[PDB]
Enzyme design. Structure first.
Site, short mmCIF file in Angstrom:
data_model
loop_
_atom_site.label_atom_id
_atom_site.label_comp_id
_atom_site.label_asym_id
_atom_site.label_seq_id
_atom_site.Cartn_x
_atom_site.Cartn_y
_atom_site.Cartn_z
N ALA A 11 46.98 34.63 43.40
CA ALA A 11 47.83 35.09 44.67
C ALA A 11 47.45 36.79 45.04
O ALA A 11 47.66 37.06 46.24
CB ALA A 11 49.13 34.78 44.84
N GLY A 44 44.71 38.63 44.27
CA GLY A 44 43.35 38.91 44.16
C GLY A 44 42.63 38.60 45.69
O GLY A 44 43.39 38.27 46.72
N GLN A 45 41.35 39.16 45.57
CA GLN A 45 40.64 38.98 46.98
C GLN A 45 40.47 37.67 47.69
O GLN A 45 40.59 37.56 48.87
CB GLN A 45 39.41 39.89 47.04
CG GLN A 45 39.39 40.84 45.65
CD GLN A 45 38.19 41.77 45.78
OE1 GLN A 45 38.35 43.07 45.68
NE2 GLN A 45 36.73 41.32 45.71
N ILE A 46 40.36 36.59 46.89
CA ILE A 46 40.03 35.26 47.75
C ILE A 46 41.41 34.83 48.19
O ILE A 46 41.47 34.46 49.39
CB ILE A 46 39.51 34.19 46.68
CG1 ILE A 46 37.83 34.45 46.67
CG2 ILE A 46 39.69 33.06 47.62
CD1 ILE A 46 37.48 33.99 45.31
N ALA A 47 42.59 35.06 47.69
CA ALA A 47 43.79 34.82 48.03
C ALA A 47 44.16 35.48 49.31
O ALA A 47 44.67 34.92 50.20
CB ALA A 47 44.96 35.04 46.98
N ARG A 77 28.60 34.28 27.84
CA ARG A 77 28.93 33.15 28.18
C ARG A 77 29.72 32.17 27.35
O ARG A 77 30.47 31.19 27.73
CB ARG A 77 27.87 32.22 28.65
CG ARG A 77 27.71 30.77 28.32
CD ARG A 77 27.17 29.60 29.47
NE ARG A 77 27.64 30.22 30.66
CZ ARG A 77 27.32 29.72 31.96
NH1 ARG A 77 26.40 28.61 32.24
NH2 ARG A 77 27.94 30.22 33.17
N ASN A 109 38.84 30.81 29.85
CA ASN A 109 39.38 29.76 31.01
C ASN A 109 39.89 28.62 30.60
O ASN A 109 40.53 28.02 31.50
CB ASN A 109 38.18 29.89 31.91
CG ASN A 109 38.06 31.03 32.92
OD1 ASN A 109 38.44 31.41 33.88
ND2 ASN A 109 37.39 32.16 32.19
N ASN A 155 35.58 30.61 39.08
CA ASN A 155 34.64 30.72 38.33
C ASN A 155 35.02 30.49 36.86
O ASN A 155 35.41 31.27 36.24
CB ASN A 155 33.21 31.28 38.70
CG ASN A 155 32.68 31.18 39.94
OD1 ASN A 155 32.38 29.86 40.37
ND2 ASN A 155 32.81 32.22 41.06
N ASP A 185 28.51 26.86 48.61
CA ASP A 185 27.06 26.62 48.54
C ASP A 185 26.65 25.70 49.79
O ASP A 185 25.66 25.99 50.29
CB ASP A 185 26.68 26.13 47.21
CG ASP A 185 27.23 26.80 46.00
OD1 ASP A 185 26.30 27.76 45.46
OD2 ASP A 185 28.30 26.46 45.55
N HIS A 233 28.55 24.41 40.77
CA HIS A 233 28.65 25.72 41.50
C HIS A 233 27.98 26.77 40.81
O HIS A 233 28.57 27.38 39.95
CB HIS A 233 30.25 25.79 41.91
CG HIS A 233 30.36 27.19 42.75
ND1 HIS A 233 29.98 27.21 44.14
CD2 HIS A 233 31.25 28.27 42.52
CE1 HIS A 233 30.27 28.27 44.63
NE2 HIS A 233 31.02 29.05 43.73
#
Ligand SMILES: [Mg+2]
Ligand code: NA
Lengths: 321, 321
Positions: A11, A13-16, A95, A102, A128, A156, A184
């Protein structure tokens, strides 16, 4: 109508920050559905979440009936009817751990979802690596229809409509039957062999097929980085918009138009079962129904198998759980 | 409908990033009206702007009919039907010092609008100090009507709505007849003597001058610094939102309700003519009408005169030019 509850992670962060305000504006469930926003993020990012909430209040949105703020997934997810899992660990570290750190987060949260969320909840994973985070969540909630976890491929999909709109000189809104396959990732297969455009076949009109292997496919996959190089920050606003498109469409209806949606494999097209893989669908009555029996040619299916192996390389990497 | 051209300056900035998408989505002029975005920013911001435009394309908006990008005001403004002046010199530097930095920009842009915009262009200054930039802008546009230059007070109006709604425990969307007078600054005066919620009088319900005087006015006044306290960045998103409210009400109407705008004084309420000063208005058919004949009590008169003292002083420092 009575309020629906929307959980949103990451909440602070930037996308939020691009997301929450269009949600409160009615962009997600409609101009007449009040909503209540229930917001998770870290202990140390609570102050920042409050800051965002002071801004939401300062918009005076008719539809916002309430906000909850918290660092506790179990509170964040209570009676949630939609959950947007935007928060995730960024790689900073091979990786190996990206994938591992996550899993923690997405087992924990799927655990919590299945314990408290509405039994009817629609989950959309944005963080991601979207597909595998989804899978870990779905797996962690035996009690909720597996068909309710999806990952976002819609960004995408939308990125590819713009490449096509541009190339064909045709209006982006007048493109039907486009498809995006897979992860994705740079690996997804943007597939227009079926796309029309306000009348005409897209192969026809464009033909070229070299612009395709050579320019088109890889532009769509390297788009995220192209955006970072230009503004020095990731594409939060286009990503929030696609999350809105994906969920709106899911809930409200697609009208026979195809959209791409990362959803648990039933087994078709050459994809193992219970795998979160992008495939075209039609949406209606709050449900998605896959588009079936599409001819899959030689080229198309080497791309389909290439992305589908990144995934298994991804799955089997977190599988120890 | 033909596309309306909407120019937006400071296009690579923070407000812009939370505003271009809502505009492209229809939020500014309606769901049935296509737009063309014309974007301005500094020369070395051009790459960052192209980034944002890439993201815009990636949203696949049906109402987005075209995009122009440029570092030239005369280009950004050509045929503009709406112009949102968001960019400005940030402080870093004495005020006397930031006023002239900014005057230097609005004389250039005000002349640009004068030379190339549509005769009817609606101009909203969002960038700070808003009233005084609006004023400079209008003085430099001798050929466009003075009534089409405005500064944004709507974020103050909107911040006062949530303060009231919290205190009175009423729903924000139910609040009516609120006025915020003067300058877009802490000296501003948010006045709820006439305001009603559901029909009850607000001044009745709250009945607390202590609260009014000591919490309310300066909470609304210092809100932006509180957002930065909490969030570490400034309140870009709620600013974008009040801009859209400002313009959308202006063009589409308020249906009888009051809203605050920073407009050029017609001499009403004892404000000298042409000073850009917030007052309550009602919108219809693309025009506003001042709300008149309001009773000004002695506390109110003192507040309104304090904010007028600051505007006389700001302008006094940019007078030359
Ligand atoms: Mg009102
Ligand atoms: Na900038």
């Amino acid at each position: 109508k009575p309020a629906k509850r929307v959980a949103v992670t990451g909440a602070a962060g930037q996308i939020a920050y691009s997301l929450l305000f269009r949600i409160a504006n009615g962009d997600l469930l409609g101009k007449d559905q009040p909503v209540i926003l229930q917001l998770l993020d870290l202990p140390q990012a609570q102050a920042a979440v409050k800051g965002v909430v002071m801004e939401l209040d300062d918009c005076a949105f008719p539809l916002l009936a309430g906000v909850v703020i918290t660092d506790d997934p179990k509170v964040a997810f209570k009676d949630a009817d939609v959950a947007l899992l935007v928060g995730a660990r960024p790689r900073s570290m091979e990786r190996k751990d990206l994938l591992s750190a996550n899993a923690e987060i997405f087992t924990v949260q799927g655990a919590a979802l299945n314990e408290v969320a509405s039994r009817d909840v629609k989950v959309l994973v944005v963080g991601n690596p979207a597909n595998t985070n989804a899978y870990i969540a779905m797996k962690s909630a035996p009690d909720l229809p597996k068909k309710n976890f999806t990952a976002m491929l819609r960004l995408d999909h939308n990125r590819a409509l713009s490449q096509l709109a541009a190339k064909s000189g045709k209006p982006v809104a007048s493109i039907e039957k486009l498809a995006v396959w897979g992860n994705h990732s740079p690996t997804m297969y943007p597939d227009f062999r079926f796309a029309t455009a306000e009348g005409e076949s897209l192969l026809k009109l464009i033909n070229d097929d070299v612009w395709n292997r050579d320019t088109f496919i890889p532009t769509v996959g390297k788009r995220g980085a192209a955006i970072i190089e230009a503004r020095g920050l990731s594409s939060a606003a286009s990503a929030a918009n696609a999350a809105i498109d994906h969920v709106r469409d899911w809930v409200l209806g697609t009208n026979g138009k195809w959209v791409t949606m990362g959803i648990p494999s039933d087994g078709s097209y050459g994809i193992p079962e219970d795998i979160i893989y992008g495939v075209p669908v039609i949406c209606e009555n709050g449900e998605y129904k896959r588009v079936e029996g599409l001819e899959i040619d030689a080229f198309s299916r080497e791309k389909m198998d290439g992305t589908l192996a990144e995934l298994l390389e991804e799955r089997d990497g977190v599988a120890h759980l």
